[PDB]
Amino acid sequence: QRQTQTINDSWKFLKGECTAAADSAFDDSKWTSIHLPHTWNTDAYTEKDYYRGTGWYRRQLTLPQGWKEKQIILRLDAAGKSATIYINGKNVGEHAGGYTACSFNITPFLSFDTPNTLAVCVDNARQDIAPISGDFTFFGGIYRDVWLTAVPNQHFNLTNHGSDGLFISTPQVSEEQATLSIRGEVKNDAPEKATLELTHTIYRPDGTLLQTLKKNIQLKAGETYAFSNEATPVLKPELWTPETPRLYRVETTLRNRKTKTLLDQSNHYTAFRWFRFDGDEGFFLNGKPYKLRGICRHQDQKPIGPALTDEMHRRDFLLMKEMGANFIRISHYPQDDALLEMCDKLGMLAWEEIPIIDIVPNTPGYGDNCERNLREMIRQHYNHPSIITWGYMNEILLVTQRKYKTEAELKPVLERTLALANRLERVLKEEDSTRISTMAFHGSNSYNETGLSKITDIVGWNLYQGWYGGDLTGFEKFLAQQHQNHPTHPMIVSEYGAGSDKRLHSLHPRAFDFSIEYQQKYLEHYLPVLEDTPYICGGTHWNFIDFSSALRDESMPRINNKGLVYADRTPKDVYHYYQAAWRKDIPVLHIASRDWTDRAGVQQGNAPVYLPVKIYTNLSEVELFIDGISLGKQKTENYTATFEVPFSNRNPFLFAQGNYQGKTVQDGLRINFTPIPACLDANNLKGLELAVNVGSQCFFTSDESQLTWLPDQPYAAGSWGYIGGKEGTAQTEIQNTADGPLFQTLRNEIEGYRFDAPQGVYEIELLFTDIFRRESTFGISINGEVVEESLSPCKESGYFRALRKKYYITNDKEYIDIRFHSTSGTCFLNGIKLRNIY
Amino acid sequence: QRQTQTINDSWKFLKGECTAAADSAFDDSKWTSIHLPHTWNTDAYTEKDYYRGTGWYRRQLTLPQGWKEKQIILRLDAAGKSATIYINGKNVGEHAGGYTACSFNITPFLSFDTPNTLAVCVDNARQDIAPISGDFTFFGGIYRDVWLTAVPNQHFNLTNHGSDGLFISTPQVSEEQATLSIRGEVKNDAPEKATLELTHTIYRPDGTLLQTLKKNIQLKAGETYAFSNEATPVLKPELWTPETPRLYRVETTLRNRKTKTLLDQSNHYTAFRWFRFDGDEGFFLNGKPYKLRGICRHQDQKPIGPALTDEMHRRDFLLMKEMGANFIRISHYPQDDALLEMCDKLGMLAWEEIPIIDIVPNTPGYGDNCERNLREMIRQHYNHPSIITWGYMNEILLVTQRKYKTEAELKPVLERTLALANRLERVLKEEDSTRISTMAFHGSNSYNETGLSKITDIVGWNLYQGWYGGDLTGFEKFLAQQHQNHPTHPMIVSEYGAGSDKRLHSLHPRAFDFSIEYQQKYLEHYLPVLEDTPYICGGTHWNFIDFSSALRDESMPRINNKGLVYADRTPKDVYHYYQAAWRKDIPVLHIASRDWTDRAGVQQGNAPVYLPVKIYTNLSEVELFIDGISLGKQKTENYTATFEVPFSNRNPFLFAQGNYQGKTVQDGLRINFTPIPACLDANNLKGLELAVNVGSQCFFTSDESQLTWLPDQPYAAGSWGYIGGKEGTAQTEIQNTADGPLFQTLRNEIEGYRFDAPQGVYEIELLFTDIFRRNRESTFGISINGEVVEESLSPCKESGYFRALRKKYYITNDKEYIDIRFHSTSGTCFLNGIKLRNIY
Ligand SMILES: [Ca+2]
Ligand SMILES: [Ca+2]
Ligand code: NA
Ligand code: NA
């Protein structure tokens, strides 16, 4: 019979190229001991220039004696970007593509007397394998399961494009009945002919036998037999939806006809559903209007990269499912079998695509490798009823339009692009007539003008109005114009999202301040448009997670921070906005302050400091308390309510409650609050560390020091603040700080900074980063005394590099008046911190 | 005037040796751009064998035109373990010791017409500098502030052992009056004699002027002039305590006598307190009995090492102060000026020591460097009234008695050790007649037998009964025995504590399971002994933080996890045990489940799963609710109550309530719960991932995958569990897993593992690690329902010892059970974990 098990354990690894590394007798004792899954690119979570090249893997294979007469199939579920397999020094085969499986019959190369050597040469530098461009890290290594499967000489074909070799589909489905087709290949690897019986057993969702199909077959030695068996039509089929994920098990078994002894067996699920996409009325599932409530999911986790164990894939799935998602865009590459298994069985519709992104290059062999990857994806995941649509391109004009401006320059590239797109559409439809084709576009009409949008069955728009420029209302406007101009192209919003950073909060959130609050504003605008617009089939939020993209700077360098959950899968508060909107079956009541647990604010006297506390909920009304005091009830709108909360005590307890479907519902949490005096005097300076995020309207709380840097404020008599200047912002990474966003904002052309404070000795810390890559040079004086004659941050440290300078100052006045004196370029300040010492 | 500012910015760094690295014209454009503070040993948070050797730092100095006529003083507050300073290629000076400041007048080496090159060669491999042994990482680099100070040619001496050059103390203090001695040195670096006026101005705590002292002084060109001025006695001084940290500012000023022009100015605090240690009655502060409620604090933070900014030092202090500590053992080395400032001003008594630990080596120069470091600590930190005691050795017999078992080998080492201890005690008392000397011992009477305990004023015992062997009650027994035999030696319990790991929880906590709950049992035992025993002056908990110690394995390799707070300074729940016990002025009500937010347990049918929920509180009575349902009121004892909580729903809200000082007090939080069926059937296998920590009585929740692995349970009819074998445990690091504690426990000589479960296709994952390196070697087969799945598995042969193996098998079950059996071939059969899912 069949035996399948992993060989993930007991590997040796070497980064780089290496002489004789495939040889059996090679000494690899000084190599690194590792366990799969593995990537050699955990460096990508700190370094922009992560290693792209070769890595070698070696494992001993000592085979059971029980396998001596069996075929042994090696399966690598994934290796990025390409792999070459050696057994005992001999090249067995290779695979191009980092997200699809490969498999090899390795029986001829193996010994059963001596130990065998499996060596794999993996390469992630190859420019002829998709992706060659895209907003994520191209991790190198063997980062999914590796298997050995031992089968008898007559067995199902396990070397058809790394798949199971069986293909099951439902040519007709309706409420009244459905048909079922069961297809595949049997291989006879014996030296003699064979007479076999093939059986398909089909089971109802409750597990009872529905039907048995039997068929005798005869195979010559070495023959591959292709079968295609139709079942008795299924009457009143139990239909599959994400809410009701009814699956019919199909067990396919192979027996020696005479002896009836079992040879090979393969289980799959099938399911009964039909669907369609309408340009006017949206998506339909089993005849009923159905809104696609979707998310996109990248497959990495800081700092292990894509080297996730399968319980981590299931963890991700369960978080998405508990959020109320009914649709996933598995992007930009096909993903672990463990994920798709959950989509089938727990219920989530799915879109899966291969990573042809940004530009079709004139790279020899690239097209041929994409075609193969498309066949591999479709054949490997053919039997997942959750999957309703295949894609192969994402924003394929984005870099093209950046690199080539003139119609002359564009012509060859657009020809090449349109040709590859039409070629893959044909391949797609050859491989699978039972699913819909899709393509994702960036927000430009060039996808219509070039003809790209005529090619697939449906289209996806990746839309970011209100994030990458424009207005939030430009979203529904863009879609309305698409629908007017191309009403027969059904639309999914295949990406939308906004970046956020737990460290940043704003009372006046703006795009690219990276505040938690602005992402909320953005998503609170987008989700109702998706829900309420009939010609929007649905949307897939970009992204479920904060994910690895080594080329990114912005507030969290190396990370795309548009997640609904943090990289460690802790949900952001806004996860519960979705959960409130998408789950009616349970009460949802979430105080949205888990992202904002370390609060501070300027206080007048001993009066409370008011800060907003948001609530996400599907209750119609909620009451918030702080340290036992009611702040009143509020009616919820768009699944949310915000309270203006009086902060005073240092460790307040927030508590909310209301009623849902007849039951009382509650939430609560403690947070931290630190008041900062508006008016400094000798008493309130003790223990005070007055820190200011100059040039910003955000609170910045360091996740390294836990200190909150307040939003900038203009000087007023009796108080403290800036004099003159204008806000400036950069998104380039700042060297030599963990507190990037503090230095990425500044007050430019600043004239002064003033604190009204008592006489004494003070520690003043000035923060600089020059972000304007003649060169800015300026003096600094404090209360009439020169503290810097001629400071040039860029001459001293270079651009985009933090300088933190502390000064001890003796104040013999009733104020500390810091003045900037420009001699070249402009004066700027990125942060300031004051403490009284004496 | 005096100008003091950092030069922490704009450095270049190179690890390793580099010829000509000091030269002004050297090309460092490919070096690494860094900002101080800096360590080159962030590797220690992953690698045991962290780099010890040389590192080079280079900065350009372009001096202000306004400094042309000034003296320029360079101060490195710390460089581990040694630094050699070069200015424009010229060797300016050097320092040995990784925790004390050094300073240099660099004026002679600088040009004001051209840019200057500052180069520092730092070395953390040197064996003639303490520590050479100890349970912490010897981080290399310049990890505290670096300063330039510009002063006139007449100024206060800034190159006396890296100190401020002024020394203020209170020779007599009582409630009625106190005396005040203001001493220091003035330097005249000018070619002309100077006639100067020295002024001391003394302010009351409320900032009003108390007294002005003025003195004419005359210095020859080049002279170092020592001054010593007595203030008028202070009548009815406002006394300093941690609770009432009253400070008197002393402002010292130097003016040119003829012109009256201000030259230099230096501020310090003084304060008035007196204290006493008694062998029977403990510690007294300002004539009153006073229990020292202490913590120890190491100075690193994962993953930045000791390269903390000063707001991080202040964060640490505020956390300790808010817990109600009134005493800090600043150990095993002196720490940032930022920390001591807060001890003075916000109020905490202090013990500070240098790191002479484990064994006194026979290394030339070692003793001399220790003496210099002691003098440097005392002079640099002289003016902190928070400090009441200086130490210089910790567990100085520990490695000695491990290494040397013969009297011939021991005798010279003990001779050497007693010699150095006596040498440093003399130095301490020469340097400071105003503070108490202390030494910390490991828990052995040999410190008395060797005579080490007769040297210092007081003694510290580092005690771990109930952790490193023994019963918890052995703690108070040890101390009673000391008090009996050495009644005149006043005692501090200078270390005590137990390791914990947020990932591990146990209903039956035991030592070295690293559960959160055992550390709680340990500390709940110790703290009342400390509080209630009169002849115990107090204790300093080891440690406030989970800290770097690269040589450690155990549950969190590279980390000593005996903290009250995690490395990132998030408090553990037991922080709030201390807070409840030590804060009377605020209500403390803490549901002690922040360490246990991801719960799971075996469920019978649909009945609730009971798990304990502890509360730490200074309330006398508390009520706990789960999802709005009251679980009743319990009376608290030892600042705690535990409820047996019925879990069922997936995301329960826990809420606690009570009254304190006439007001309602509340706490609450949500946590996650996952029920696991005791009896598998087709219904409840859907979406189930049944994971078990074989060989352990601990729940293990992975901080990587968030999956909880259940405590092991014996097979019972209709259920699932192990057959045969006994528990085994290792503390060695396990390779190739983030989930070390899962692999560090196993069931040895296991016979089977069984799940009663319906027919179907299952994924079985088996976890292995061979922990018996002293093996002959373990080889075994495994069958599942008679099907062989391994005919000859040997973890140690295939992967080696202490390395994770995780193997997945797909099996087809045509029975009503899944019966995994282990078949010995060689050595023993073992299993470290198992996980089951139904696939078809
Ligand atoms: Ca997998
Ligand atoms: Ca400092
Ligand atoms: Na800023
Ligand atoms: Na275990």
PDB file of N, CA and C in Angstrom, chain B residues 738-791:
ATOM      1  N   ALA B 738      11.987  26.793  17.842  1.00  0.00           N
ATOM      2  CA  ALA B 738      11.670  27.926  18.714  1.00  0.00           C
ATOM      3  C   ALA B 738      10.951  27.476  19.970  1.00  0.00           C
ATOM      4  N   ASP B 739      10.513  26.219  19.982  1.00  0.00           N
ATOM      5  CA  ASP B 739       9.657  25.712  21.051  1.00  0.00           C
ATOM      6  C   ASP B 739      10.414  24.763  21.963  1.00  0.00           C
ATOM      7  N   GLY B 740      11.587  25.201  22.396  1.00  0.00           N
ATOM      8  CA  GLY B 740      12.471  24.412  23.232  1.00  0.00           C
ATOM      9  C   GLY B 740      11.850  23.610  24.372  1.00  0.00           C
ATOM     10  N   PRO B 741      11.043  24.256  25.242  1.00  0.00           N
ATOM     11  CA  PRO B 741      10.523  23.498  26.394  1.00  0.00           C
ATOM     12  C   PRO B 741       9.644  22.307  26.030  1.00  0.00           C
ATOM     13  N   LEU B 742       8.972  22.369  24.888  1.00  0.00           N
ATOM     14  CA  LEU B 742       8.225  21.231  24.363  1.00  0.00           C
ATOM     15  C   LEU B 742       9.138  20.026  24.128  1.00  0.00           C
ATOM     16  N   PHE B 743      10.325  20.271  23.592  1.00  0.00           N
ATOM     17  CA  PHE B 743      11.268  19.204  23.294  1.00  0.00           C
ATOM     18  C   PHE B 743      12.125  18.839  24.487  1.00  0.00           C
ATOM     19  N   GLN B 744      12.203  19.715  25.492  1.00  0.00           N
ATOM     20  CA  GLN B 744      13.076  19.442  26.640  1.00  0.00           C
ATOM     21  C   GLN B 744      12.455  18.444  27.622  1.00  0.00           C
ATOM     22  N   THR B 745      11.181  18.137  27.442  1.00  0.00           N
ATOM     23  CA  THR B 745      10.501  17.158  28.273  1.00  0.00           C
ATOM     24  C   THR B 745      10.078  15.986  27.376  1.00  0.00           C
ATOM     25  N   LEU B 746      10.118  14.779  27.924  1.00  0.00           N
ATOM     26  CA  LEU B 746       9.749  13.607  27.147  1.00  0.00           C
ATOM     27  C   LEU B 746       9.239  12.490  28.047  1.00  0.00           C
ATOM     28  N   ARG B 747       8.607  11.504  27.420  1.00  0.00           N
ATOM     29  CA  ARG B 747       8.252  10.266  28.106  1.00  0.00           C
ATOM     30  C   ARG B 747       9.238   9.228  27.620  1.00  0.00           C
ATOM     31  N   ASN B 748      10.099   8.805  28.540  1.00  0.00           N
ATOM     32  CA  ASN B 748      11.142   7.828  28.283  1.00  0.00           C
ATOM     33  C   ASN B 748      10.649   6.404  28.564  1.00  0.00           C
ATOM     34  N   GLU B 749      11.146   5.435  27.795  1.00  0.00           N
ATOM     35  CA  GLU B 749      10.666   4.048  27.878  1.00  0.00           C
ATOM     36  C   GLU B 749       9.170   3.967  27.602  1.00  0.00           C
ATOM     37  N   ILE B 750       8.703   4.864  26.741  1.00  0.00           N
ATOM     38  CA  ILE B 750       7.315   4.874  26.374  1.00  0.00           C
ATOM     39  C   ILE B 750       6.982   3.570  25.638  1.00  0.00           C
ATOM     40  N   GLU B 751       5.762   3.083  25.822  1.00  0.00           N
ATOM     41  CA  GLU B 751       5.346   1.838  25.176  1.00  0.00           C
ATOM     42  C   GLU B 751       4.381   2.111  24.041  1.00  0.00           C
ATOM     43  N   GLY B 752       3.474   3.046  24.256  1.00  0.00           N
ATOM     44  CA  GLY B 752       2.533   3.403  23.226  1.00  0.00           C
ATOM     45  C   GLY B 752       1.912   4.763  23.437  1.00  0.00           C
ATOM     46  N   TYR B 753       1.148   5.185  22.439  1.00  0.00           N
ATOM     47  CA  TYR B 753       0.277   6.327  22.571  1.00  0.00           C
ATOM     48  C   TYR B 753      -0.995   5.993  21.822  1.00  0.00           C
ATOM     49  N   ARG B 754      -2.137   6.179  22.458  1.00  0.00           N
ATOM     50  CA  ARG B 754      -3.371   5.753  21.845  1.00  0.00           C
ATOM     51  C   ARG B 754      -4.442   6.825  21.842  1.00  0.00           C
ATOM     52  N   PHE B 755      -5.138   6.893  20.726  1.00  0.00           N
ATOM     53  CA  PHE B 755      -6.325   7.718  20.560  1.00  0.00           C
ATOM     54  C   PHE B 755      -7.480   6.831  20.140  1.00  0.00           C
ATOM     55  N   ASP B 756      -8.558   6.833  20.903  1.00  0.00           N
ATOM     56  CA  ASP B 756      -9.767   6.176  20.454  1.00  0.00           C
ATOM     57  C   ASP B 756     -10.445   7.166  19.539  1.00  0.00           C
ATOM     58  N   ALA B 757     -10.617   6.771  18.286  1.00  0.00           N
ATOM     59  CA  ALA B 757     -11.053   7.688  17.236  1.00  0.00           C
ATOM     60  C   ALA B 757     -11.640   6.902  16.094  1.00  0.00           C
ATOM     61  N   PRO B 758     -12.583   7.500  15.372  1.00  0.00           N
ATOM     62  CA  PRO B 758     -13.270   6.783  14.299  1.00  0.00           C
ATOM     63  C   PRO B 758     -12.370   6.488  13.108  1.00  0.00           C
ATOM     64  N   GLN B 759     -12.834   5.604  12.239  1.00  0.00           N
ATOM     65  CA  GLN B 759     -12.087   5.309  11.029  1.00  0.00           C
ATOM     66  C   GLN B 759     -11.932   6.581  10.217  1.00  0.00           C
ATOM     67  N   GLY B 760     -10.805   6.698   9.533  1.00  0.00           N
ATOM     68  CA  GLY B 760     -10.591   7.850   8.687  1.00  0.00           C
ATOM     69  C   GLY B 760      -9.139   7.948   8.336  1.00  0.00           C
ATOM     70  N   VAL B 761      -8.776   9.028   7.646  1.00  0.00           N
ATOM     71  CA  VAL B 761      -7.377   9.298   7.370  1.00  0.00           C
ATOM     72  C   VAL B 761      -6.887  10.351   8.398  1.00  0.00           C
ATOM     73  N   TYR B 762      -5.743  10.100   9.025  1.00  0.00           N
ATOM     74  CA  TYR B 762      -5.203  11.023  10.035  1.00  0.00           C
ATOM     75  C   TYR B 762      -3.776  11.455   9.739  1.00  0.00           C
ATOM     76  N   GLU B 763      -3.464  12.687  10.140  1.00  0.00           N
ATOM     77  CA  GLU B 763      -2.097  13.181  10.148  1.00  0.00           C
ATOM     78  C   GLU B 763      -1.613  13.037  11.562  1.00  0.00           C
ATOM     79  N   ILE B 764      -0.532  12.304  11.746  1.00  0.00           N
ATOM     80  CA  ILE B 764       0.064  12.126  13.051  1.00  0.00           C
ATOM     81  C   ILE B 764       1.418  12.800  12.975  1.00  0.00           C
ATOM     82  N   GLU B 765       1.698  13.721  13.907  1.00  0.00           N
ATOM     83  CA  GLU B 765       3.017  14.309  13.999  1.00  0.00           C
ATOM     84  C   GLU B 765       3.674  13.861  15.291  1.00  0.00           C
ATOM     85  N   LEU B 766       4.866  13.313  15.154  1.00  0.00           N
ATOM     86  CA  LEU B 766       5.645  12.876  16.288  1.00  0.00           C
ATOM     87  C   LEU B 766       6.840  13.801  16.467  1.00  0.00           C
ATOM     88  N   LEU B 767       7.065  14.203  17.706  1.00  0.00           N
ATOM     89  CA  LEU B 767       8.210  15.052  18.062  1.00  0.00           C
ATOM     90  C   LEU B 767       9.230  14.325  18.902  1.00  0.00           C
ATOM     91  N   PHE B 768      10.478  14.398  18.465  1.00  0.00           N
ATOM     92  CA  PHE B 768      11.588  13.748  19.135  1.00  0.00           C
ATOM     93  C   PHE B 768      12.775  14.651  19.409  1.00  0.00           C
ATOM     94  N   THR B 769      13.418  14.390  20.536  1.00  0.00           N
ATOM     95  CA  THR B 769      14.735  14.891  20.853  1.00  0.00           C
ATOM     96  C   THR B 769      15.398  13.918  21.814  1.00  0.00           C
ATOM     97  N   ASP B 770      16.608  13.479  21.492  1.00  0.00           N
ATOM     98  CA  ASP B 770      17.329  12.592  22.385  1.00  0.00           C
ATOM     99  C   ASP B 770      18.091  13.445  23.368  1.00  0.00           C
ATOM    100  N   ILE B 771      17.742  13.324  24.650  1.00  0.00           N
ATOM    101  CA  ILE B 771      18.380  14.130  25.693  1.00  0.00           C
ATOM    102  C   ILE B 771      19.385  13.350  26.541  1.00  0.00           C
ATOM    103  N   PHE B 772      19.630  12.081  26.204  1.00  0.00           N
ATOM    104  CA  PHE B 772      20.526  11.247  27.027  1.00  0.00           C
ATOM    105  C   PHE B 772      21.862  11.026  26.357  1.00  0.00           C
ATOM    106  N   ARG B 773      22.571  12.134  26.148  1.00  0.00           N
ATOM    107  CA  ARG B 773      23.861  12.176  25.456  1.00  0.00           C
ATOM    108  C   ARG B 773      24.849  11.202  26.051  1.00  0.00           C
ATOM    109  N   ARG B 774      24.678  10.929  27.332  1.00  0.00           N
ATOM    110  CA  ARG B 774      25.594  10.053  28.028  1.00  0.00           C
ATOM    111  C   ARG B 774      25.417   8.584  27.609  1.00  0.00           C
ATOM    112  N   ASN B 775      24.493   8.326  26.686  1.00  0.00           N
ATOM    113  CA  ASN B 775      24.445   7.025  26.022  1.00  0.00           C
ATOM    114  C   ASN B 775      25.596   6.930  25.022  1.00  0.00           C
ATOM    115  N   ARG B 776      22.938   1.078  24.851  1.00  0.00           N
ATOM    116  CA  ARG B 776      23.672   2.087  24.103  1.00  0.00           C
ATOM    117  C   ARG B 776      22.708   3.137  23.521  1.00  0.00           C
ATOM    118  N   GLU B 777      22.937   3.554  22.278  1.00  0.00           N
ATOM    119  CA  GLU B 777      22.211   4.686  21.720  1.00  0.00           C
ATOM    120  C   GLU B 777      20.826   4.283  21.254  1.00  0.00           C
ATOM    121  N   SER B 778      19.863   5.175  21.466  1.00  0.00           N
ATOM    122  CA  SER B 778      18.475   4.830  21.235  1.00  0.00           C
ATOM    123  C   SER B 778      18.110   4.687  19.759  1.00  0.00           C
ATOM    124  N   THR B 779      17.586   3.514  19.432  1.00  0.00           N
ATOM    125  CA  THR B 779      17.075   3.195  18.112  1.00  0.00           C
ATOM    126  C   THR B 779      15.784   2.430  18.323  1.00  0.00           C
ATOM    127  N   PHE B 780      14.719   2.749  17.591  1.00  0.00           N
ATOM    128  CA  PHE B 780      13.477   2.003  17.757  1.00  0.00           C
ATOM    129  C   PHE B 780      12.576   2.069  16.538  1.00  0.00           C
ATOM    130  N   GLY B 781      11.689   1.085  16.445  1.00  0.00           N
ATOM    131  CA  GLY B 781      10.649   1.089  15.457  1.00  0.00           C
ATOM    132  C   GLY B 781       9.389   1.678  16.027  1.00  0.00           C
ATOM    133  N   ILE B 782       8.498   2.052  15.127  1.00  0.00           N
ATOM    134  CA  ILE B 782       7.192   2.565  15.475  1.00  0.00           C
ATOM    135  C   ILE B 782       6.160   1.977  14.529  1.00  0.00           C
ATOM    136  N   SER B 783       5.065   1.479  15.093  1.00  0.00           N
ATOM    137  CA  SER B 783       3.960   1.001  14.304  1.00  0.00           C
ATOM    138  C   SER B 783       2.684   1.709  14.694  1.00  0.00           C
ATOM    139  N   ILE B 784       1.753   1.797  13.758  1.00  0.00           N
ATOM    140  CA  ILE B 784       0.465   2.391  14.056  1.00  0.00           C
ATOM    141  C   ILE B 784      -0.613   1.429  13.568  1.00  0.00           C
ATOM    142  N   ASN B 785      -1.345   0.843  14.516  1.00  0.00           N
ATOM    143  CA  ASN B 785      -2.305  -0.207  14.206  1.00  0.00           C
ATOM    144  C   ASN B 785      -1.644  -1.352  13.425  1.00  0.00           C
ATOM    145  N   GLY B 786      -0.419  -1.708  13.789  1.00  0.00           N
ATOM    146  CA  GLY B 786       0.250  -2.827  13.150  1.00  0.00           C
ATOM    147  C   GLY B 786       1.039  -2.453  11.914  1.00  0.00           C
ATOM    148  N   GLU B 787       0.733  -1.308  11.304  1.00  0.00           N
ATOM    149  CA  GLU B 787       1.502  -0.806  10.163  1.00  0.00           C
ATOM    150  C   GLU B 787       2.804  -0.209  10.641  1.00  0.00           C
ATOM    151  N   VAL B 788       3.915  -0.644  10.063  1.00  0.00           N
ATOM    152  CA  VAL B 788       5.185  -0.049  10.403  1.00  0.00           C
ATOM    153  C   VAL B 788       5.271   1.360   9.791  1.00  0.00           C
ATOM    154  N   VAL B 789       5.663   2.371  10.580  1.00  0.00           N
ATOM    155  CA  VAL B 789       5.907   3.714  10.023  1.00  0.00           C
ATOM    156  C   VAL B 789       7.380   4.131  10.185  1.00  0.00           C
ATOM    157  N   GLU B 790       8.084   3.482  11.109  1.00  0.00           N
ATOM    158  CA  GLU B 790       9.527   3.581  11.226  1.00  0.00           C
ATOM    159  C   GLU B 790      10.012   2.205  11.560  1.00  0.00           C
ATOM    160  N   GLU B 791      10.937   1.634  10.803  1.00  0.00           N
ATOM    161  CA  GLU B 791      11.454   0.349  11.242  1.00  0.00           C
ATOM    162  C   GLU B 791      12.731   0.537  12.046  1.00  0.00           C
TER     163      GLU B 791
END
